[PDB]
Scaffold this active site. Structure first.
Site, PDB file in Angstrom:
ATOM      1  N   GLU B  56       0.839  -1.332  -0.036  1.00 48.24           N
ATOM      2  CA  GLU B  56      -0.122  -0.081  -0.127  1.00 48.24           C
ATOM      3  C   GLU B  56       0.926   1.224   0.055  1.00 48.24           C
ATOM      4  N   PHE B 118     -11.502  -7.610  14.115  1.00 43.45           N
ATOM      5  CA  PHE B 118     -10.485  -8.243  13.235  1.00 43.45           C
ATOM      6  C   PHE B 118      -9.952  -7.205  12.054  1.00 43.45           C
ATOM      7  N   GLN B 119      -8.705  -6.756  11.949  1.00 50.65           N
ATOM      8  CA  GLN B 119      -8.228  -5.676  11.018  1.00 50.65           C
ATOM      9  C   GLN B 119      -8.878  -4.418  11.489  1.00 50.65           C
ATOM     10  N   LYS B 168     -17.519  -1.472   5.905  1.00 55.14           N
ATOM     11  CA  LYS B 168     -17.896  -2.544   4.661  1.00 55.14           C
ATOM     12  C   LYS B 168     -19.412  -2.640   4.859  1.00 55.14           C
ATOM     13  N   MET B 488      23.789  11.106   2.233  1.00 55.12           N
ATOM     14  CA  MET B 488      23.647  12.416   3.093  1.00 55.12           C
ATOM     15  C   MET B 488      23.819  12.199   4.590  1.00 55.12           C
TER      16      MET B 488
HETATM   17  C1  LIG Z   1      -6.907 -15.065   8.248  1.00 58.35           C
HETATM   18  C2  LIG Z   1      -7.076 -15.013   9.739  1.00 58.35           C
HETATM   19  C3  LIG Z   1      -7.827 -15.933  10.204  1.00 58.35           C
HETATM   20  C4  LIG Z   1      -7.854 -16.133  11.231  1.00 58.35           C
HETATM   21  N1  LIG Z   1      -8.553 -17.406  12.021  1.00 58.35           N
HETATM   22  C5  LIG Z   1      -8.577 -17.622  13.306  1.00 58.35           C
HETATM   23  C6  LIG Z   1      -9.325 -18.824  13.687  1.00 58.35           C
HETATM   24  O1  LIG Z   1     -10.187 -19.505  13.120  1.00 58.35           O
HETATM   25  N2  LIG Z   1      -9.131 -19.298  15.103  1.00 58.35           N
HETATM   26  C7  LIG Z   1      -8.318 -18.419  16.040  1.00 58.35           C
HETATM   27  O2  LIG Z   1      -8.328 -18.543  17.085  1.00 58.35           O
HETATM   28  N3  LIG Z   1      -7.970 -17.133  15.677  1.00 58.35           N
HETATM   29  C8  LIG Z   1      -8.035 -16.822  14.182  1.00 58.35           C
HETATM   30  N4  LIG Z   1      -7.357 -15.763  13.872  1.00 58.35           N
HETATM   31  C9  LIG Z   1      -6.483 -14.823  14.799  1.00 58.35           C
HETATM   32  C10 LIG Z   1      -7.358 -14.106  15.544  1.00 58.35           C
HETATM   33  O3  LIG Z   1      -7.653 -12.722  14.890  1.00 58.35           O
HETATM   34  C11 LIG Z   1      -6.931 -13.472  16.937  1.00 58.35           C
HETATM   35  O4  LIG Z   1      -5.648 -12.690  16.528  1.00 58.35           O
HETATM   36  C12 LIG Z   1      -6.578 -14.447  17.928  1.00 58.35           C
HETATM   37  O5  LIG Z   1      -7.881 -15.586  18.095  1.00 58.35           O
HETATM   38  C13 LIG Z   1      -6.369 -14.014  19.225  1.00 58.35           C
HETATM   39  O6  LIG Z   1      -6.088 -15.090  20.109  1.00 58.35           O
HETATM   40  P1  LIG Z   1      -5.873 -14.892  21.561  1.00 58.35           P
HETATM   41  O7  LIG Z   1      -7.124 -14.627  22.124  1.00 58.35           O
HETATM   42  O8  LIG Z   1      -5.575 -15.979  22.413  1.00 58.35           O
HETATM   43  O9  LIG Z   1      -4.710 -13.768  22.157  1.00 58.35           O
HETATM   44  P2  LIG Z   1      -4.795 -12.139  22.230  1.00 58.35           P
HETATM   45  O10 LIG Z   1      -5.349 -11.506  21.240  1.00 58.35           O
HETATM   46  O11 LIG Z   1      -3.456 -11.873  22.245  1.00 58.35           O
HETATM   47  O12 LIG Z   1      -5.799 -11.898  23.507  1.00 58.35           O
HETATM   48  C14 LIG Z   1      -5.090 -12.593  24.613  1.00 58.35           C
HETATM   49  C15 LIG Z   1      -6.137 -12.250  25.709  1.00 58.35           C
HETATM   50  O13 LIG Z   1      -5.390 -12.708  26.907  1.00 58.35           O
HETATM   51  C16 LIG Z   1      -5.326 -11.660  27.804  1.00 58.35           C
HETATM   52  N5  LIG Z   1      -3.966 -11.850  28.523  1.00 58.35           N
HETATM   53  C17 LIG Z   1      -2.606 -11.285  28.214  1.00 58.35           C
HETATM   54  N6  LIG Z   1      -1.536 -11.797  28.736  1.00 58.35           N
HETATM   55  C18 LIG Z   1      -2.158 -12.217  30.117  1.00 58.35           C
HETATM   56  C19 LIG Z   1      -1.651 -13.008  31.314  1.00 58.35           C
HETATM   57  N7  LIG Z   1      -0.287 -12.912  31.710  1.00 58.35           N
HETATM   58  N8  LIG Z   1      -2.588 -13.282  32.199  1.00 58.35           N
HETATM   59  C20 LIG Z   1      -4.023 -13.450  32.054  1.00 58.35           C
HETATM   60  N9  LIG Z   1      -4.313 -13.013  30.968  1.00 58.35           N
HETATM   61  C21 LIG Z   1      -3.793 -12.415  29.786  1.00 58.35           C
HETATM   62  C22 LIG Z   1      -5.304 -10.391  26.998  1.00 58.35           C
HETATM   63  O14 LIG Z   1      -5.174  -9.196  27.676  1.00 58.35           O
HETATM   64  C23 LIG Z   1      -6.376 -10.620  26.127  1.00 58.35           C
HETATM   65  O15 LIG Z   1      -7.798 -10.430  26.624  1.00 58.35           O
HETATM   66  C24 LIG Z   1      -7.232 -15.236  12.769  1.00 58.35           C
HETATM   67  C25 LIG Z   1      -6.445 -14.284  11.894  1.00 58.35           C
HETATM   68  C26 LIG Z   1      -6.371 -14.107  10.483  1.00 58.35           C
HETATM   69  C27 LIG Z   1      -5.268 -13.157   9.817  1.00 58.35           C
HETATM   70  C1  LIG Z   2      17.861  16.043   1.788  1.00 61.88           C
HETATM   71  C2  LIG Z   2      17.027  17.340   1.497  1.00 61.88           C
HETATM   72  C3  LIG Z   2      17.685  18.598   1.286  1.00 61.88           C
HETATM   73  C4  LIG Z   2      16.920  19.586   1.054  1.00 61.88           C
HETATM   74  N1  LIG Z   2      17.638  20.843   0.604  1.00 61.88           N
HETATM   75  C5  LIG Z   2      16.715  21.951   0.078  1.00 61.88           C
HETATM   76  C6  LIG Z   2      17.478  23.159  -0.331  1.00 61.88           C
HETATM   77  O1  LIG Z   2      18.823  23.170  -0.210  1.00 61.88           O
HETATM   78  N2  LIG Z   2      16.846  24.291  -1.103  1.00 61.88           N
HETATM   79  C7  LIG Z   2      15.392  23.909  -0.823  1.00 61.88           C
HETATM   80  O2  LIG Z   2      14.823  25.070  -1.546  1.00 61.88           O
HETATM   81  N3  LIG Z   2      14.613  22.954  -0.624  1.00 61.88           N
HETATM   82  C8  LIG Z   2      15.440  21.993  -0.020  1.00 61.88           C
HETATM   83  N4  LIG Z   2      14.828  20.756   0.528  1.00 61.88           N
HETATM   84  C9  LIG Z   2      13.158  20.637   0.384  1.00 61.88           C
HETATM   85  C10 LIG Z   2      12.615  21.337   1.442  1.00 61.88           C
HETATM   86  O3  LIG Z   2      12.502  20.748   2.536  1.00 61.88           O
HETATM   87  C11 LIG Z   2      10.999  21.988   1.199  1.00 61.88           C
HETATM   88  O4  LIG Z   2      10.310  20.728   0.841  1.00 61.88           O
HETATM   89  C12 LIG Z   2      10.751  22.922  -0.074  1.00 61.88           C
HETATM   90  O5  LIG Z   2      11.751  24.032   0.047  1.00 61.88           O
HETATM   91  C13 LIG Z   2       9.798  23.563  -0.118  1.00 61.88           C
HETATM   92  O6  LIG Z   2       9.435  24.337  -1.274  1.00 61.88           O
HETATM   93  P1  LIG Z   2       8.039  25.199  -1.579  1.00 61.88           P
HETATM   94  O7  LIG Z   2       7.782  25.971  -0.224  1.00 61.88           O
HETATM   95  O8  LIG Z   2       8.294  25.774  -2.698  1.00 61.88           O
HETATM   96  O9  LIG Z   2       6.973  24.321  -1.442  1.00 61.88           O
HETATM   97  P2  LIG Z   2       5.532  23.805  -0.456  1.00 61.88           P
HETATM   98  O10 LIG Z   2       6.435  23.228   0.519  1.00 61.88           O
HETATM   99  O11 LIG Z   2       4.775  22.916  -1.070  1.00 61.88           O
HETATM  100  O12 LIG Z   2       5.157  25.110   0.250  1.00 61.88           O
HETATM  101  C14 LIG Z   2       4.293  25.850  -0.968  1.00 61.88           C
HETATM  102  C15 LIG Z   2       3.813  27.247  -0.197  1.00 61.88           C
HETATM  103  O13 LIG Z   2       3.126  27.802  -1.359  1.00 61.88           O
HETATM  104  C16 LIG Z   2       1.810  28.030  -0.982  1.00 61.88           C
HETATM  105  N5  LIG Z   2       0.772  27.689  -2.102  1.00 61.88           N
HETATM  106  C17 LIG Z   2       0.490  26.561  -2.491  1.00 61.88           C
HETATM  107  N6  LIG Z   2      -0.105  26.704  -3.532  1.00 61.88           N
HETATM  108  C18 LIG Z   2      -0.704  27.971  -3.784  1.00 61.88           C
HETATM  109  C19 LIG Z   2      -1.391  28.522  -4.904  1.00 61.88           C
HETATM  110  N7  LIG Z   2      -2.045  28.122  -5.780  1.00 61.88           N
HETATM  111  N8  LIG Z   2      -1.454  30.107  -4.965  1.00 61.88           N
HETATM  112  C20 LIG Z   2      -0.627  30.810  -3.736  1.00 61.88           C
HETATM  113  N9  LIG Z   2       0.138  30.183  -2.907  1.00 61.88           N
HETATM  114  C21 LIG Z   2       0.195  28.685  -3.005  1.00 61.88           C
HETATM  115  C22 LIG Z   2       1.681  27.040  -0.007  1.00 61.88           C
HETATM  116  O14 LIG Z   2       0.473  26.782   0.863  1.00 61.88           O
HETATM  117  C23 LIG Z   2       2.750  27.060   0.926  1.00 61.88           C
HETATM  118  O15 LIG Z   2       2.872  28.088   1.906  1.00 61.88           O
HETATM  119  C24 LIG Z   2      15.141  19.657   0.960  1.00 61.88           C
HETATM  120  C25 LIG Z   2      14.695  18.421   1.049  1.00 61.88           C
HETATM  121  C26 LIG Z   2      15.420  17.077   1.270  1.00 61.88           C
HETATM  122  C27 LIG Z   2      14.562  15.732   1.415  1.00 61.88           C
HETATM  123  C1  LIG Z   3      18.969   9.744   3.652  1.00 58.98           C
HETATM  124  C2  LIG Z   3      19.372   8.642   2.467  1.00 58.98           C
HETATM  125  C3  LIG Z   3      20.546   8.271   2.013  1.00 58.98           C
HETATM  126  O1  LIG Z   3      20.843   6.928   0.991  1.00 58.98           O
HETATM  127  P1  LIG Z   3      20.503   6.751  -0.558  1.00 58.98           P
HETATM  128  O2  LIG Z   3      21.537   5.729  -0.781  1.00 58.98           O
HETATM  129  O3  LIG Z   3      19.398   6.601  -0.941  1.00 58.98           O
HETATM  130  O4  LIG Z   3      21.356   8.096  -1.152  1.00 58.98           O
HETATM  131  P2  LIG Z   3      22.670   8.923  -1.196  1.00 58.98           P
HETATM  132  O5  LIG Z   3      23.748   7.763  -0.752  1.00 58.98           O
HETATM  133  O6  LIG Z   3      22.716   9.390  -2.596  1.00 58.98           O
HETATM  134  O7  LIG Z   3      22.555   9.820  -0.174  1.00 58.98           O
END
Ligand SMILES: Cc1cc2nc3c(=O)[nH]c(=O)nc-3n(C[C@H](O)[C@H](O)[C@H](O)COP(=O)(O)OP(=O)(O)OC[C@H]3O[C@@H](n4cnc5c(N)ncnc54)[C@H](O)[C@@H]3O)c2cc1C
Ligand SMILES: Cc1cc2nc3c(=O)[nH]c(=O)nc-3n(C[C@H](O)[C@H](O)[C@H](O)COP(=O)(O)OP(=O)(O)OC[C@H]3O[C@@H](n4cnc5c(N)ncnc54)[C@H](O)[C@@H]3O)c2cc1C
Ligand SMILES: CCCOP(=O)(O)OP(=O)(O)O
Ligand SMILES: COC(=O)c1ccccc1S(=O)(=O)NC(=O)Nc1nc(C)cc(C)n1
Ligand SMILES: COC(=O)c1ccccc1S(=O)(=O)NC(=O)Nc1nc(C)cc(C)n1
Ligand SMILES: [K+]
Ligand SMILES: [K+]
Ligand SMILES: [Mg+2]
Ligand SMILES: [Mg+2]
Lengths: 596, 593
Positions: B56, B118-119, B168, B488
């Site tokens: 993502e 979940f999630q 959902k 850098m």
């Molecule tokens: C694709 C997918 C499918 C899944 N299918 C299943 C399934 O079919 N069956 C299943 O079991 N799970 C399934 N899960 C996992 C599930 O989401 C839960 O993570 C899991 O069931 C949680 O198990 P748990 O309650 O034992 O542990 P936890 O979620 O860690 O909960 C532990 C509980 O124990 C308590 N506790 C912690 N430490 C202590 C301690 N020292 N003394 C006393 N109490 C304590 C906690 O505070 C809490 O209430 C699935 C997950 C995914 C990603």
């Molecule tokens: C390793 C590293 C080194 C860097 N070194 C440099 C450096 O040496 N020099 C440098 O310049 N930068 C450097 N930067 C980038 C820097 O951090 C800033 O991201 C950048 O300077 C911001 O430029 P900006 O203000 O033009 O754009 P932005 O940060 O996007 O700011 C734009 C500004 O314009 C305003 N504005 C936006 N749209 C409109 C519109 N339609 N009408 C009117 N106003 C608007 C905004 O709201 C805001 O206040 C570096 C970054 C890194 C990662």
């Molecule tokens: C802050 C990052 C540095 O590493 P990277 O290898 O990506 O670039 P550079 O070595 O060119 O700084």
């Protein structure tokens, strides 16, 4: 007061506090804002530093490390993108109760709130995914905040915490003495109350005719957990089922094992839970992947509760999870293991439960984890790979740790592996983060250098974080990466097959050549697609020295069963049926215009 | 009054329709459980094209690249939980650089929210500080409304990211009742007064300087009106990193980039100017240097009421936020420049001003240690050469970059002349931005030659998106300036931490074998003799290709203004000093570096 730190920089104090907190490993990635701390840990002998390619990887490595060692995983990243890149690992640790202390560099305090270079409101962003977080305002309070972070992360229900470190604070020199307490780590009425609930729990257990132990991750948060669980199970003859996160807490070779319960749990475990008059929940939170339709959950226990002869007992350490999902009859607060130990002597030894065990045994013969096995010329089956690997791995005699990605391979690993040891299954359950597999395995291997660490991954999950392969080589972690390649996002295609009439919307990704990828990354790459070669390849895989990746081409569109979904109760599951699979397959080819 | 064109449709189908109404032609996303109702509705949709990444974060940066190159908002569609948390970086990145982006995140059923489902994640809370606005759709009836508000907010004022959380059950729900047709379809004197005073102050300026930023690129006529004003009043123009491409650097009035690593002439002109005309720039800390030392002459001209600082800013919050200005012209810069044009007196010449500027350009050029017989290829040289090679293709060229030295060198040594051709992460400075942004830009401009000038460390962050480029059909050209280090950071370590290189050296994979494993062509260059031929084959390759150039290590980016230094207190390049630093580095690292 304490003056021993006077003259040191915040960074040096940070370094010093790590050894005081017994930290032997730190996962992180350098950056501008956090430079003062990196300069301080430069060549430090206090701990091993593990460098990933992406901060998310540092985060998952720390989780795997914590899951495998029982110690909090420590992360050290920079401000801005460095911090935002660890939000997922924090949300993941928060969902699964994993102890983790995340240190994020921050811009100077004087630049905060000015939209400064690489500035992010990380304390605000991570508020909902940390048990606690804070921004150190001065070097004087650095030791206090570090100590509070470690204490909060590892107590109650473990979890992640975040400590924001302004660059001016870590670069600053401590010029003032500070309280001695802030530099050193770490009710009778209450005790009587817990003991009272323990006595009630015991009385209820001694009354049960069809009890079931519903065990989760909580039992693994204490070294003696599994042992006391087994003692209770043997003493009162109570069958045991575990959640996905409880796998390994109970020896599945034991006759009283019911295996996993839930959405994709063993039919026997689910049926036992639906027919039990007493459910003893130990370290489990009744999440929605376990309970099925809540209104249909545990009808017999509910009936027994209404008649004052059973119901639900809950050994929970966190008040937040007590009576949050279902009404429980007795809640025993605190550490489960500790409380099981106190209750033991009050439990009446049971000679046998012939009827209950007989019923459970009929279900075991009737509902095994059946699936469509290999046939002449067919592709290898994913479930078959797990069964074979489990055997090969266990036979080595070594300590085995399994991590996974998220999806079908994950469920099959859970179902078909034979779990017997505590802390050997490291998987993302609550948040279900794809990509967890590889980095978690790397962290787990760092925690246990002598263990055989296997990542049972999916192809889509593996793609999320495959860049960490080079990290495994650089870290010296001989992890075994297994990819059950079905060239699909299986978990999602299964749901699409079931609820969306086989409409596969963007769930098929183009994979790179995994073997060439592995070689480009610096490790051994192996591939197998023919049934006749699986055994040899799994053998080579496990016995290979150094990191290695093995891709197994497996059959596609194979659903995980049994399955309980939607408004179905745990006892209203879909069961495997070879005839139906064939019909669904034909139906699939028609609907997809022959694309799948 | 009421509309029923959506009645009978699921929220997902409504989403599909709304993309069409919002003139969306591309959606970047990754499917997941909570967002399935929407993915089902857009299955085989002809309303727009879909781009699938491997992570993502990739979708996010791809959308940013798309937005930067097209001028249209980048649309993201991901699932709940990890899907949503995985796009926090891209949102924070878009928030920092003002990039229009609409992020749609699936969410668990409203009946599961608040139960640690979940999630499930508190996405609205998490993304609050990283979005101009966000919301959680509570019913299918308000979906059309929330979508319209999102696109409007993301494209108004200073463009930025917005997030719409979609439960959902809401996207699966069918619209039964009709909804308001309005929710289904997508002082003034103070300003004029400021424009007049601005024009007068400019006609009075003796040493004016146009400080231009990304704001000028937010309007199609921006660059054109900028040139007009520059010519009309004969004012030298300097741009920020995000303003590059808004002014022809071939024009004699170009001062190039200013700031921490900006051209010395640009920084000197700013420090000696009596009037600074800030156009679409926010005076970030990478440009101003030590704030108290910023524009000393403009401040004096202000005290004597004969100059100072004029600021064309669309966001009131960014006016007088860093430095006190004399005149503030609120609103779109391009628009206000057109209204002020006539009030500007046509200057015929500025001999004295241009004389001083010209001698600075001759004395302070982008100097660096050039290649010598037997030495490694220099990073700066690659940029200059590639710049020409790319130009000689005659095609429209778009350049993206990672973060670090390669990024600064790309900014300095490339000849910028066209608007929307430089896409880089400046505010948040997200490593790994290069590849996914390039892929997004290529989608926005199918005919353009898209080049990603990356660093080895930065590339490693999101290299999994290589396979995405192949699947998306985007023939991006990936250039990796490999110095086998976090350039850098090691530069800062060399300068401020006595050459203590703490964990700034990651082990790299074989980039060529990686490229091939990912399905694209891979090229590598080590010798100076093969550089030219390799660069030509590189840009001439039909499909996506990766070229790794082994460059010299521990090479500092100069000039440089850091710490409490003023823009005029920069560190200039010196061949003898570099040799002395090399010896010092060796002796301090035991010959390791
Ligand atoms: C694709 C997918 C499918 C899944 N299918 C299943 C399934 O079919 N069956 C299943 O079991 N799970 C399934 N899960 C996992 C599930 O989401 C839960 O993570 C899991 O069931 C949680 O198990 P748990 O309650 O034992 O542990 P936890 O979620 O860690 O909960 C532990 C509980 O124990 C308590 N506790 C912690 N430490 C202590 C301690 N020292 N003394 C006393 N109490 C304590 C906690 O505070 C809490 O209430 C699935 C997950 C995914 C990603
Ligand atoms: C390793 C590293 C080194 C860097 N070194 C440099 C450096 O040496 N020099 C440098 O310049 N930068 C450097 N930067 C980038 C820097 O951090 C800033 O991201 C950048 O300077 C911001 O430029 P900006 O203000 O033009 O754009 P932005 O940060 O996007 O700011 C734009 C500004 O314009 C305003 N504005 C936006 N749209 C409109 C519109 N339609 N009408 C009117 N106003 C608007 C905004 O709201 C805001 O206040 C570096 C970054 C890194 C990662
Ligand atoms: C802050 C990052 C540095 O590493 P990277 O290898 O990506 O670039 P550079 O070595 O060119 O700084
Ligand atoms: C990270 O930024 C800030 O913390 C930050 C933010 C605003 C003001 C001042 C700082 S700073 O002056 O305390 N540090 C840096 O500017 N560091 C830095 N900058 C670059 C360009 C590359 C590297 C490696 N480090
Ligand atoms: C995403 O979860 C929820 O939204 C969610 C959360 C809590 C309760 C109910 C749901 S749900 O019943 O509306 N949807 C799903 O459970 N979906 C789903 N589950 C799995 C295991 C794999 C895939 C691909 N999709
Ligand atoms: K099993
Ligand atoms: K230039
Ligand atoms: Mg798969
Ligand atoms: Mg580099």
């Amino acid at each position: 007061m304490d003056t021993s730190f006077v003259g040191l920089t915040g960074g040096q104090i940070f370094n010093e506090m790590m050894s005081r907190q017994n930290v032997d490993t730190v996962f992180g990635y350098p950056g501008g804002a956090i430079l003062p701390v990196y300069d301080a840990i430069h060549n430090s002998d206090k701990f091993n530093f593990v460098l990933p390619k992406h901060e998310q990887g540092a985060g998952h490595m720390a989780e795997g490390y914590a899951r495998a060692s029982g110690k909090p995983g420590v992360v050290l990243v920079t401000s801005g993108p460095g911090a935002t890149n660890v939000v997922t690992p924090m949300a993941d640790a928060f969902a699964d109760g994993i102890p983790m202390v995340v240190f994020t560099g921050q811009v100077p305090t004087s630049a905060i709130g000015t939209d400064a270079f690489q500035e992010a409101d990380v304390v605000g962003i991570s508020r909902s995914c940390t048990k606690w977080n804070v921004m150190v305002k001065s070097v004087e309070e650095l030791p206090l905040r570090i100590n509070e972070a470690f204490e909060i992360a590892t107590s109650g229900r473990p979890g992640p915490v975040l400590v924001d470190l302004p660059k001016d604070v870590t670069a600053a020199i401590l010029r003032n003495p500070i309280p001695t307490k802030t530099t050193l780590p770490s009710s009778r009425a209450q005790d009587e109350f817990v003991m009272q609930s323990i006595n009630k729990a015991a009385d209820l257990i001694n009354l049960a005719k069809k009890p079931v132990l519903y065990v989760g991750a909580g039992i693994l948060n204490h070294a003696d957990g599994p042992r006391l669980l087994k003692e209770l199970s043997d003493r009162a003859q109570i069958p045991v089922t575990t959640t996905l996160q409880g796998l390994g807490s109970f020896d599945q070779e034991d006759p009283k094992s019911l295996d996993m319960l839930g959405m994709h749990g063993c039919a026997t475990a689910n049926l036992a839970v639906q027919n039990a008059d007493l459910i003893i929940a130990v370290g489990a939170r009744f999440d929605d992947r376990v309970t099925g339709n809540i209104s249909k959950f545990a009808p017999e226990a509910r009936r027994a509760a209404a008649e004052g002869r059973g119901g639900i007992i809950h050994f929970e350490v966190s008040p937040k999870n007590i009576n949050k999902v279902v009404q429980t009859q007795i809640a025993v607060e605190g550490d489960a293991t500790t409380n099981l130990g106190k209750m033991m002597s009050k439990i009446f030894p049971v000679k046998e439960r012939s009827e209950w065990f007989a019923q459970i045994n009929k279900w075991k013969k009737e509902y095994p984890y059946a699936y469509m096995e290999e046939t002449p010329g067919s592709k290898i089956k994913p479930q078959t790979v797990i069964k074979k690997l489990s055997k090969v791995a266990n036979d080595t005699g070594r300590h085995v740790i399994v991590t996974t990605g998220v999806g079908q391979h994950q469920m099959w690993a859970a179902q078909h592996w034979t779990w017997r040891n505590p802390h050997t299954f490291i998987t993302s359950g609550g948040l279900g983060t794809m990509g967890y597999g590889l980095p978690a395995a790397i962290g787990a291997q760092v925690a246990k250098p002598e263990s055989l660490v296997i990542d049972i991954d999916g192809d889509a999950s593996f793609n999320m974080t495959l860049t960490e392969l080079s990290s495994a080589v650089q870290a010296g972690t001989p992890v075994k990466i297994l990819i059950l390649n079905n060239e699909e996002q299986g978990m999602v295609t299964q749901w699409q097959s079931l609820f969306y009439e086989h409409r596969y919307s963007h769930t098929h990704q183009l994979n790179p050549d995994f073997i060439k990828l592995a070689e480009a990354m610096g490790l051994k790459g192996l591939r197998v697609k023919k049934q006749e070669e699986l055994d040899a390849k799994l053998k080579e895989f496990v016995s290979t020295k150094g990191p290695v990746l093995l891709e197994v081409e497996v059959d596609k569109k194979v659903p995980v069963l049994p399955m309980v979904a939607g408004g179905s109760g745990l006892d209203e599951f879909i069961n495997f049926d070879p005839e139906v699979e064939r019909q669904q397959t034909e139906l699939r080819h028609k609907r997809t215009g022959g694309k799948h």
